[PDB]
Symmetry: none
Subunit: 171 residues, 4 copies
Amino acid sequence: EDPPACGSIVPRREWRALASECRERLTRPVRYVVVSHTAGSHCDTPASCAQQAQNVQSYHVRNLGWCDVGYNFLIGEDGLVYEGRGWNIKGAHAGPTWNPISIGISFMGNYMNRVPPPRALRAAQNLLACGVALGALRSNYEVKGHRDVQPTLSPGDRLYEIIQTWSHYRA
Amino acid sequence: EDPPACGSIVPRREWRALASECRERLTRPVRYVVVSHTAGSHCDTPASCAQQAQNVQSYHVRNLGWCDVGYNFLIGEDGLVYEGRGWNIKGAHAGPTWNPISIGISFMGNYMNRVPPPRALRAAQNLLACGVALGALRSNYEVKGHRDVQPTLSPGDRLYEIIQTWSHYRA
Amino acid sequence: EDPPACGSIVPRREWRALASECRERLTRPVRYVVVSHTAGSHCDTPASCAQQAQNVQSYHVRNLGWCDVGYNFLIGEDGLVYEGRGWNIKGAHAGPTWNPISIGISFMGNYMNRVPPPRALRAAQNLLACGVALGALRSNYEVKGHRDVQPTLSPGDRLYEIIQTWSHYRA
Amino acid sequence: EDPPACGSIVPRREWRALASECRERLTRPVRYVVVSHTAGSHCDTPASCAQQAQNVQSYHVRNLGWCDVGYNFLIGEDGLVYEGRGWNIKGAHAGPTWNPISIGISFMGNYMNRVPPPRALRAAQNLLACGVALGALRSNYEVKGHRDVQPTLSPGDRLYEIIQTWSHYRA
């Protein structure tokens, strides 16, 4: 019994999320993390980023008809992590081959022509360390770009270039 | 049917495509058409557009490990249609709910800030008429934007605005 | 009352059902359909299948003490659908996690060593199309086996194998 | 095959029908529906009703020398619809003025002194809704009795009295 308080995660309730209808679970420990971007507007305050998480969920639930926002976690330029489907529920973010064997994290913004600010990158890397510490991720997890597994520009040229330098990145 | 009975399509061989390994079939007549963009470079000559189709296939086959280019057909700004998986083989373009019940056509380019030239739009609309005439599509088929069924900017703001005016578009 | 109600369902009165005491409602549109079997006798005539629906209700009401037959609808090998709790009332068929978010349809018989006849399968698939058309089910609904959500042999090996081939099945 | 049901029709092969030789087509959308009875034996099980459809076809093909059973659809007291010539092929049921502009549905039995059971009537009304939904019938279609267009007792006094109460009936 080794309890970490590792999570500085904004919970669903705090960003005023609609209730999830999703039921399918991931088998922990998970081996893969897929990094994407939302390609929408960016935010840099907790107030605007909470609104942005709502908007992203609203799009996936109301328009696309999904059970919840597709990503397991979202990352703001405010420096905070927003709880999506979390560590235990299967996401809808990288297609049916990868969705069942991965955690999908998405940076809120468009990173074709912009880098995320250092605090966003810290939030993301720390989130992953927390995942390992809980047993949600494998200690030898592997990070993929969204474009490495699906046909897309995501996670953005600038952000893609960055994640390639990460220790756990695998092409 | 006066032999062919429609369509000026560049065949796989002509654009120098790798052989397809895909086996799964669509049930004709198909009800849905999903319009996307490649989000890559655009071309405006048969020589450059044939190369572009190769590049798109190369990405899907060599990197993503797919059986063939994901789209059923591609549209060039040269005014020609490039044969993808065609009318009969299931595509990999709009996820596992839509892939089995739809034809996916993709315009080669990024149409966020650009409209396709009239000849591209003609090629696409004519391709669809040919589909109905063959019995590949239902006479009352419905056109969706890629963004209407998956979380994405595709098919681009400008092109999305255009397809919304089409007779067969359904929100 | 002039209902534009889809499909040919045998109403409660016609199969001589006891009056329901159930009051709790589902939130439409519903996302999930759970397929089970009764594991009892099969019938292949309207006269015997009406009797079978009575017997199934009798068991759930008199012995198990439930407010009505547990299933929303039952399917006969006669090729007809028997009205259970219907589209709007919560069922008692797949436990307390799934009962409030699903429609439960049950085939009358034991399908471990037997397939339902084609007309039973048609009745069931048509019933579901009717559900979507009324707004009772979501257009992107998902079909689960009873065994996929509870520890059970239901809906039978043979029938389970069949529902796996359905378009809306999700594991 | 190809047709994924609609309102649960027993297909030609399932009732073991001889292959149709008919070639003349109706122009959809059709305006008229003529209701008749076979004036033969009634059946109330899928097994007996499948046999009855065979017998009716056998009479029209072997003795009368027709290309197929004359009716577009037949209705059983088992509660099921039997596929005749279907929605697109011209029937032989109400003479040469009406045959080219109508769908002919026939109840299997003699309804002079007998009413069809409610499930037969439901099957018929549902079949017609399916017709409108497919574009085979006009949304403002009109229902005639066989006796309203030809000199005959068909569709039987009891059944004639009933169809007169229908919303789309026109004298």
